[PDB]
Amino acid sequence: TDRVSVGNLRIARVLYDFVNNEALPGTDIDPDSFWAGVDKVVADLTPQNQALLNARDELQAQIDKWHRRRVIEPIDMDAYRQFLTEIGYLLPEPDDFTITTSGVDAEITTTAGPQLVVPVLNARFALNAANARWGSLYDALYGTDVIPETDGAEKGPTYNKVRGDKVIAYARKFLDDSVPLSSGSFGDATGFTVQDGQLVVALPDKSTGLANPGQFAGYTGAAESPTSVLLINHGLHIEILIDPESQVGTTDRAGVKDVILESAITTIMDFEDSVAAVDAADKVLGYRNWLGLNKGDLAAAVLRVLNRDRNYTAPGGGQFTLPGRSLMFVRNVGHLMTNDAIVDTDGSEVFEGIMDALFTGLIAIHGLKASDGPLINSRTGSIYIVKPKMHGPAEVAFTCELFSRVEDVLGLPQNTMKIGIMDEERRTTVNLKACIKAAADRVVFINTGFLDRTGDEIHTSMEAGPMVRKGTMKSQPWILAYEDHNVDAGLAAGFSGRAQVGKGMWTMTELMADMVETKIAQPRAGASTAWVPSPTAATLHALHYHQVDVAAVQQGLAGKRRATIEQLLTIPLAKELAWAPDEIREEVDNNCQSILGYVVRWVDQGVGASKVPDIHDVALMEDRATLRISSQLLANWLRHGVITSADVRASLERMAPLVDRQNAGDVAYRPMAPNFDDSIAFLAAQELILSGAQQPNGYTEPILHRRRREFKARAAE
Ligand SMILES: O=C(O)CCSc1ccc(Cl)cc1
Ligand SMILES: [Mg+2]
Numbered sequence: 001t002d003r004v005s006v007g008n009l010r011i012a013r014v015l016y017d018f019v020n021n022e023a024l025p026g027t028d029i030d031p032d033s034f035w036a037g038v039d040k041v042v043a044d045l046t047p048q049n050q051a052l053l054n055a056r057d058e059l060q061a062q063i064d065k066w067h068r069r070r071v072i073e074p075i076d077m078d079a080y081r082q083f084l085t086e087i088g089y090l091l092p093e094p095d096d097f098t099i100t101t102s103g104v105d106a107e108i109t110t111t112a113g114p115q116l117v118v119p120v121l122n123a124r125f126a127l128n129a130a131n132a133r134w135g136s137l138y139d140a141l142y143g144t145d146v147i148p149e150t151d152g153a154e155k156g157p158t159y160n161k162v163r164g165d166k167v168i169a170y171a172r173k174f175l176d177d178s179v180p181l182s183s184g185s186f187g188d189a190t191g192f193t194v195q196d197g198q199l200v201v202a203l204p205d206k207s208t209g210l211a212n213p214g215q216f217a218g219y220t221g222a223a224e225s226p227t228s229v230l231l232i233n234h235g236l237h238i239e240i241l242i243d244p245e246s247q248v249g250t251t252d253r254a255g256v257k258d259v260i261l262e263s264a265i266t267t268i269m270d271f272e273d274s275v276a277a278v279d280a281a282d283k284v285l286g287y288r289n290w291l292g293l294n295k296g297d298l299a300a301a302v303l304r305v306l307n308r309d310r311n312y313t314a315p316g317g318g319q320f321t322l323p324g325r326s327l328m329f330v331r332n333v334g335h336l337m338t339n340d341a342i343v344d345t346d347g348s349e350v351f352e353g354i355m356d357a358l359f360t361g362l363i364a365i366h367g368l369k370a371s372d373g374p375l376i377n378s379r380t381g382s383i384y385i386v387k388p389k390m391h392g393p394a395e396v397a398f399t400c401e402l403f404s405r406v407e408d409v410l411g412l413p414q415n416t417m418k419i420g421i422m423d424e425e426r427r428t429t430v431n432l433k434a435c436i437k438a439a440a441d442r443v444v445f446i447n448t449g450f451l452d453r454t455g456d457e458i459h460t461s462m463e464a465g466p467m468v469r470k471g472t473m474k475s476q477p478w479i480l481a482y483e484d485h486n487v488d489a490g491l492a493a494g495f496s497g498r499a500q501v502g503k504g505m506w507t508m509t510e511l512m513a514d515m516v517e518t519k520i521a522q523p524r525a526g527a528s529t530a531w532v533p534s535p536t537a538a539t540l541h542a543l544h545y546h547q548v549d550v551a552a553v554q555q556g557l558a559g560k561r562r563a564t565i566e567q568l569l570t571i572p573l574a575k576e577l578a579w580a581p582d583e584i585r586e587e588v589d590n591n592c593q594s595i596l597g598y599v600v601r602w603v604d605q606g607v608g609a610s611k612v613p614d615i616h617d618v619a620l621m622e623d624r625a626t627l628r629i630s631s632q633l634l635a636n637w638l639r640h641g642v643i644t645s646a647d648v649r650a651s652l653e654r655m656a657p658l659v660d661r662q663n664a665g666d667v668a669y670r671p672m673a674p675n676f677d678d679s680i681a682f683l684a685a686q687e688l689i690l691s692g693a694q695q696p697n698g699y700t701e702p703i704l705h706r707r708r709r710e711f712k713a714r715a716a717e
Contacts, residue, residue: 007039012280027365037409067463098494099440103380107265107327111235112528112550114541116264119274124300131307132264132535133326140539141167144512171259178233178546180211189254194223197315218312237262263538267326273623274609278705280341291363296371332356334389357406386420391427393434424449425456432489447502448486455628459698461571466640468574481567487526496554505531510619523548526557533621591630592651596659600681613662627700635692680711
């Protein structure tokens with residue numbers, strides 16, 4: 001065929017060529033040695049990879065049987081826990097330890113703030129995310145509902161001064177709250193000067209300095225009329241841009257044009273659940289963008305490029321620089337899937353996670369070298385890889401061994417390849433300390449991946465009985481315990497000042513007032529970072545890190561244990577007679593709509609993340625984990641007789657045209673209705689639900705990938 005032979009491997013040519021021509025030059029890695037390394041690591045680690053996947057299946061079969069064999073109404077927690085221990089699911093917790101991970105950048109070890117996640121196959125989005133380190137607070141306030149569109153203050157086609165004024169006043173208050181003046185308010189400022197290394201703020205009847213002069217980090221322009229003033233609070237920078245010759249500056253009492261906030265200080269470039277990549281061509285598109293980001297030369301159509309560092313004058317008068325870019329992680333795929341980018345002599349596809357480590361690892365070397373500017377990414381010499389969907393410490397150890405072996409192939413120092421552990425599978429949750437210990441010399445974060453975690457929750461106890469509704473899951477005892485337990489594990493392992501303790505995505509992209517009002521819970525909970533779906537939401541979530549002293553919050557949580565194993569293990573079973581018929585129908589429609597809405601963009605257009613209108617037309621930006629949840633929940637309800645297979649069909653058929661109409665503003669869209677059996681997307685949605693109970697841990701990829709490939713093939717013939 002078209003493939004390249006390397007040992008027992010047959011490498012898709014598009015991949016072979018990309019690596020030889022694009023990825024390898026400049027890494028000083030001998031191309032032949034590299035490919036021999038690929039062959040050898042794949043040969044050596046494939047059996048253990050398959051062994052771990054089989055173990056998941058066996059543990060799940062035993063749990064299914066445990067539930068099927070009993071008919072008591074309340075779960076005997078003591079017996080359940082004993083059983084889980086006996087089968088090797090719940091492992092002993094190791095003695096206290098402190099992570100030793102080193103060579104990590106300050107953005108990760110020290111700085112608390114928002115973290116962006118973006119699909120790596122979308123070059124423009126990736127570039128926007130990387131540039132989102134600094135963002136306009138005025139743009140974020142004016143452009144969203146954080147400033148209400150009440151009478152007189154609504155967005156028009158052109159600039160509304162009443163709205164602009166609300167924006168200005170909101171930000172003045174932020175300034176008062178974050179970097180307080182000794183006396184008076186920023187709301188009454190008339191100017192800013194730097195005198196003998198001190199920030200002086202002019203008021204009407206007097207002048208004043210900062211309550212804490214140390215929050216003054218610098219400025220631009222002349223000290224006697226700066227163009228901007230740089231502040232710092234809780235390690236995050238705040239920049240006041242001064243220019244009366246600007247749209248809003250002319251209206252402003254101190255000539256202030258904008259307030260820029262340091263926002264997304266880290267960004268995860270995603271190869272997993274926000275992208276649709278099912279063959280060699282898709283992986284190469286992803287790898288090519290990852291390469292462009294690391295070499296610093298990625299450029300997208302509508303011409304977008306990466307930002308340079310930002311130049312400042314220190315308070316004393318000396319010069320310095322700050323990073324202009326969000327520090328990048330890459331999220332590899334997990335241990336499950338294979339991909340035909342490489343097959344063996346049998347035609348057997350190679351594990352995609354192994355490939356990701358080799359290739360995203362190889363590619364990240366460019367981020368440690370000069371960009372033809374200074375190097376793009378890690379100044380401390382680390383490569384940062386988020387690893388999703390791991391179950392238990394053995395799976396964590398395997399990943400670490402994979403990274404070690406890749407480090408050899410790449411001629412990299414051991415432990416160069418750091419690991420962001422997603423805690424989004426129940427067997428990881430209940431063995432979290434052990435998972436951290438397995439990666440104690442590589443771990444740079446843990447994060448509560450809650451949509452996925454809920455999917456795993458449902459699949460794991462699928463045989464136990466009907467689960468509560470999807471909307472109910474977010475407030476269930478198990479998940480609230482999971483959230484605290486994650487923080488507790490991290491802090492006890494010494495994450496404070498060493499590694500990120502992260503929480504999940506705000507998915508409601510247009511509900512920013514709600515985000516600002518409520519997402520503050522996450523840093524109040526001791527999280528040094530949390531996920532936001534866009535640069536705009538990053539700028540807004542930043543506010544939370546100014547109001548909350550995360551470092552202090554973490555210090556106060558030290559040595560506390562706020563969740564028991566019993567709480568973690570509390571299965572979200574719905575109570576008897578929980579739902580009226582109408583509520584059941586709502587929930588079915590809800591879930592069928594969320595499956596159809598997402599699947600149709602995935603299968604038809606290879607889009608894995610977008611603003612998808614939900615059943616109530618609320619814009620949600622969710623990755624593939626939303627599919628895992630909805631399909632598992634419906635499968636759970638079908639399994640326990642809450643709904644019939646005709647209910648599912650009727651809902652699918654009822655919701656399909658609604659999704660069709662929701663996609664009206666898209667020229668590439670093909671209506672699913674009314675020829676359902678001719679729509680691969682519709683059939684994919686159906687299959688995910690009807691085959692849901694039989695998918696390993698409820699994973700949707702084997703079905704989704706097959707259907708997407710099916711669509712790709714039909715579109716060519
Ligand atoms: O990882 C999980 O389990 C859920 C993460 S939610 C998410 C939404 C959107 C994008 Cl672009 C990325 C992630
Ligand atoms: Mg996930």
